[PDB]
């Protein structure tokens, strides 16, 4: 059964499932996550789609940073009350999330052997860097720096794993103007990490 090798938000949820900005009173964006167990690694496939107007108005500025922060317990279940994503991940049922309980979700987690908590001599191994793109209204691709940070902090004793994705741009012009701004969509970003034992 290959549907149990994926842990992911669904393809295009009907409502926003993530609250990036703290000023937002409710969920303001759709976070698309995918985690695929490829051998001893996890292939992670992430992007965001803006829903709220104040999230979509970020394309009118030239210095933007925002952050999806995800916390997971000892079984790998998402801590939605502390995470940006407010809907728990699940397995594959076609284009949608499955419904039941999670089996071996802990194996999807970043490995604490490779990515330890609170080790100053080994902090450099917690970092992943990359680039995604924002297509403008005139089909201009603007590069976006992505910093993925694995197992950085535990907010409480419940948190056992941590994934912090940070998108940012520092551009010479705003990618859009106030009239032409429609929706902040980032091109997908694929990174890898060594996964925890099942």
């Amino acid at each position: 059964d290959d549907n149990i090798n994926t842990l992911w938000t669904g393809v295009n949820p009907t409502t926003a499932n993530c609250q990036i900005m703290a000023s937002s009173e409710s969920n303001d964006c759709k976070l698309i996550l995918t985690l695929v167990k490829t051998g001893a690694l996890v292939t992670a496939f992430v992007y965001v789609i803006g829903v709220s107007n104040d999230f979509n108005m970020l394309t009118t500025h030239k210095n933007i940073n925002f952050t999806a922060e995800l916390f997971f317990d000892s079984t790998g279940n998402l801590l939605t009350s502390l995470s940006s994503l407010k809907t728990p991940l699940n397995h594959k049922s076609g284009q949608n999330m499955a419904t039941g309980a999670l089996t071996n979700a802990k194996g999807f987690m970043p490995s604490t052997t490779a990515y330890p908590f609170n080790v100053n001599s080994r902090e450099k191994e917690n970092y992943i860097y990359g680039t995604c793109y924002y297509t403008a209204s005139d089909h201009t691709a603007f590069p976006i720096d992505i910093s993925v940070m694995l197992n950085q902090r535990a907010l409480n004793n419940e948190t056992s794993y941590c994934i912090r994705v940070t998108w940012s741009w520092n551009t010479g012009v705003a990618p859009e103007v106030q009239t032409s701004a429609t929706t902040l969509v980032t091109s997908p970003f694929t990174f890898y990490y060594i996964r925890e034992d099942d």
Binding site: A136, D138, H139, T140, A141, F142, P143, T171, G172, V173, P175
Partner: protein, 231 residues
């Protein structure tokens, strides 16, 4: 009367004018050679075989001619207008089954203009600028930003647009732009007591009037030009 080789293929006029945009993708339809046959239709001479005879700036193999339909397209070699503004293209239509003989036919000229995109960022032809400003001086056009843009002199891809980045918030100055010279004439609308021994240092940002092309947007990182004006 048969469909013998008895005439030359017929054009509609000797001069065809097409036009294509700079940096267009491959297989972009530039134009069409609208020809016709004076013989009977559905015949061998009606099967017109167009043929590009000559490019005058022949070195880049830019255009492609669909020999069956006469549609002229762009190729994988990308057009750059700032090295070749326009192209001239001698083509001929040929009757028969594609036999190549030295028999004369009717051949036409094609003029293809290349339409400019704003693919060049304006740069300043001057580096240090400084002016002397006194009191009861107003509407004073003392200094002018030299700029240089390569995009088709006279067009809106070439006309400089200026904004203040820092230094002028009180409203001391204001930029007009000269189009015959592409010049950032910056003015003086608020007077300074010259005796104050003050500074009015500022820095500007240079860009074209039209928005940049999608190839060079996201690559445009303007560094503010630091004009220091002493009063």
């Amino acid at each position: 009367v048969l469909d013998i080789n008895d005439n030359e293929p017929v054009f509609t006029q000797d001069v065809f004018v097409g036009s294509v945009e700079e940096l267009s993708a491959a297989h972009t339809l530039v134009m069409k050679i609208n020809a016709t046959d004076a013989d009977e239709p559905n015949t061998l001479n009606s099967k017109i075989s167009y043929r590009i005879v000559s490019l005058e700036p022949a070195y880049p193999p830019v255009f492609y001619l669909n020999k069956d339909t006469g549609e002229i397209y762009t190729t994988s070699v990308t057009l750059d207008r700032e090295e070749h503004s326009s192209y001239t293209l001698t083509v001929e239509a040929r009757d028969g089954n594609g036999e190549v003989t030295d028999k004369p036919v009717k051949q036409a000229q094609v003029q293809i203009r290349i339409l400019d995109v704003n693919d060049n960022i304006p740069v300043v032809e001057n580096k240090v600028l400084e002016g002397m400003v006194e009191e009861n001086q107003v509407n004073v056009e003392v200094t002018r930003i030299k700029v240089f843009d390569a995009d088709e002199i006279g067009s809106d891809n070439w006309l400089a647009n200026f904004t203040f980045a820092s230094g002028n918030e009180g409203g001391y100055f204001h930029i007009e732009t000269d189009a015959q010279t592409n010049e950032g004439i910056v003015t003086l609308i608020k007077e300074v007591d010259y005796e104050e021994m003050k500074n009015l240092d500022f820095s500007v940002i240079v860009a074209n009037k039209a928005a940049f092309h999608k190839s060079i947007r996201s690559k445009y990182k303007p560094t503010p030009i630091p004009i220091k004006v002493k009063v």
